């Protein structure tokens, strides 16, 4: 709580070609579990989590036919924005969608999401009320008055309160084990010369999942700038992070790292040891 479900769609128009590349990617509780990609040999929705092999062949056929429709919804919407911003079809353009629902700890719908970006900037988003819109540009006003005109908000409201919550619920029962899974970080601190006689101590956390993790250094007390790096996939489903610090030579046994990760039964404490 909040358990959640999103679909992240992307349509990149391709100059010359008749229509665009479209990618849909579904997430439950932030893990990818389904995915459609239009330039695949046979383009279909596919599972991206073992516990989606559960679903039947009618599911995939029906979701695949949705992608095909979305694909065209984007092809159109692309052509239309081209007009709004006075663009040509000689250059590629990108239209993106985030949508779905969060469930509060009481399991009822907490928030709905339906938002768009053009060229990677906010364009139009459905407000939390699920009735109105916020528009970034003048250009989005054209689309806004269109969607106010056509009563677009309600129909998306229905998805968000219905199918989103229905199916999130069913996906959460199906994946329970897998979605609660956590791998613990295996940590070590390494020693690197840097200056003279100042040195770098770097605490690594390796092989963890999910990616949410906190590394902190400590000099008896509590940390002045330690460099850290943005959490990084290892490529095997686990993640990596490090936090380094600048330390005086010899005077570095006083220096402690802590790794906070939900899969850890206890936060780890490390320090350098030759």
């Amino acid at each position: 709580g909040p358990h959640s479900m999103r679909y992240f769609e992307t349509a990149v128009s391709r100059p010359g070609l008749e229509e665009p590349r479209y990618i849909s990617v579904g997430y439950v509780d932030n893990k990818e579990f389904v995915r459609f990609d239009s330039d695949a040999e046979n383009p279909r929705y596919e599972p991206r989590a073992p516990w989606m092999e559960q679903e039947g062949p009618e599911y995939w056929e029906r979701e695949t036919q949705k992608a095909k429709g979305q694909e065209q919804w984007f092809r159109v919407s692309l052509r239309n924005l081209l007009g709004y911003y006075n663009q040509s079809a000689g250059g590629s353009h990108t239209l993106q969608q985030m949508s779905g629902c969060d469930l509060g700890s009481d399991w009822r719908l907490l928030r709905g999401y339906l938002q768009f970006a053009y060229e990677g900037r906010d364009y139009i988003a459905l407000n939390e009320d699920l009735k109105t819109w916020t528009a970034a540009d003048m250009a989005a006003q054209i689309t806004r008055r269109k969607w106010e005109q056509s009563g677009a908000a309600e129909h998306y409201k229905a998805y968000l309160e219905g199918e989103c919550v229905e199916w999130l619920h069913r996906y959460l029962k199906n994946g329970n084990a897998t979605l609660l899974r956590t791998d613990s970080p295996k940590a070590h601190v390494t020693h690197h010369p840097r200056s003279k006689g100042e040195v770098t101590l770097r605490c690594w956390a390796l092989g963890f999942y999910p990616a949410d993790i906190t590394l902190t250094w400590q000099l008896n007390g509590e940390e002045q700038d330690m460099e850290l790096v943005e959490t990084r996939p290892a490529g095997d489903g686990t993640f990596q992070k490090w936090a380094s610090v600048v330390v005086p030579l010899g005077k570095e046994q006083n220096y402690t790292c802590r790794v906070y990760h939900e899969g850890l039964p206890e936060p780890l404490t490390l320090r350098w040891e030759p």
Binding site: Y7, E9, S24, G26, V34, Y45, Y59, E63, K66, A67, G69, Q70, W73, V76, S77, N80, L81, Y84, L95, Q97, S99, G100, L114, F116, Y123, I124, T143, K146, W147, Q149, S150, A152, H155, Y156, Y159, L160, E163, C164, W167
Partner: peptide, 9 residues
């Protein structure tokens, strides 16, 4: 299951 959009832009 994914959404399907209504009025285009």
């Amino acid at each position: 299951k994914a959404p399907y959009n209504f009025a285009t832009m």
